[PDB]
Ligand binder design. Sequence first.
Ligand SMILES: OC[C@H]1O[C@@H](O[C@H]2[C@H](O)[C@@H](O)[C@H](O[C@H]3[C@H](O)[C@@H](O)[C@H](O[C@H]4[C@H](O)[C@@H](O)[C@H](O)O[C@@H]4CO)O[C@@H]3CO)O[C@@H]2CO)[C@H](O)[C@@H](O)[C@@H]1O
Ligand SMILES: [Ca+2]
Ligand SMILES: [Ca+2]
Length: 270
Amino acid sequence: KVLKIRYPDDGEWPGAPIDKDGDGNPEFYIEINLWNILNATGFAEMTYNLTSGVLHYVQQLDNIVLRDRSNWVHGYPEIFYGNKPWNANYATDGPIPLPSKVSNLTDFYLTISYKLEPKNGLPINFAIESWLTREAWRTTGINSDEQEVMIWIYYDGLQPAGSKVKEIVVPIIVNGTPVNATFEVWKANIGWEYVAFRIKTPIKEGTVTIPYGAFISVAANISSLPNYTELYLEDVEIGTEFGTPSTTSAHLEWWITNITLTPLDRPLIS
Ligand SMILES: OC[C@H]1O[C@@H](O[C@H]2[C@H](O)[C@@H](O)[C@H](O[C@H]3[C@H](O)[C@@H](O)[C@H](O[C@H]4[C@H](O)[C@@H](O)[C@H](O)O[C@@H]4CO)O[C@@H]3CO)O[C@@H]2CO)[C@H](O)[C@@H](O)[C@@H]1O
Ligand SMILES: [Ca+2]
Ligand SMILES: [Ca+2]
């Protein structure tokens, strides 16, 4: 009834599928994803109640030493839908068929209910991201002619990679009320093209719905990549990146109670 993964007990790379009907196709996949920590004292644990659907993350890390300080952040504990292109983990039991080419995909709303509790000023975000790859089912990383798109709906103490490009309006729903929100658009070249959308009014807790194609359309429009609409939207990842190279302790708790992808009857890109 409860799935639990724990670092370092389960190794340096704990993760697991959420497969509530036991049908061998996960609905979501969870990873502690401390991808830039070489060593730390303490623990991180992610637990998922299969009946309530609550995902609860508890992290108490100290003495943190990074694998490569140029990566900046320490990790990105997360839950995702689709095929994460950095490894062989996937989740495809859901209404949106990911991966799909961006030219063939419907737009969709993403709704998340959550609450974040970083401790003592830990730098952090709550970031949704997708990878856009040239092949349909990538599992071995990302090339220079591909894109990473992130959407930050909370942040404290972190800035996206690269340079600020512009600000856009995106109509979103926050705590049941439709609102016009502003996102800063950032672009970088970090081994691949990176585009990030950082909300100007961070939301630390509640229920937020965003229209995914508002973001992908802007990422396509500002892209320097050729043949953008032939890329595959591999996945939708939701997690909290945390830490900086001068962060040595990172205590954080959060909860996610619902994630829903709702198809729209319109193209993803407009
Ligand atoms: O060899 C040990 C172990 O490796 C596992 O594979 C690791 C790769 O080694 C590691 O490079 C990869 O890290 C990814 C990570 O999964 C992504 O979440 C992260 O995304 C970053 C993004 O790169 C940034 O630009 C943006 O700002 O932040 C996001 C979120 O922080 O990117 C890094 C790549 O740099 O993770 C793999 C595991 O998922 C093997 O799978 C295992 O078998 C080996 O034992
Ligand atoms: Ca399933
Ligand atoms: Ca994968």
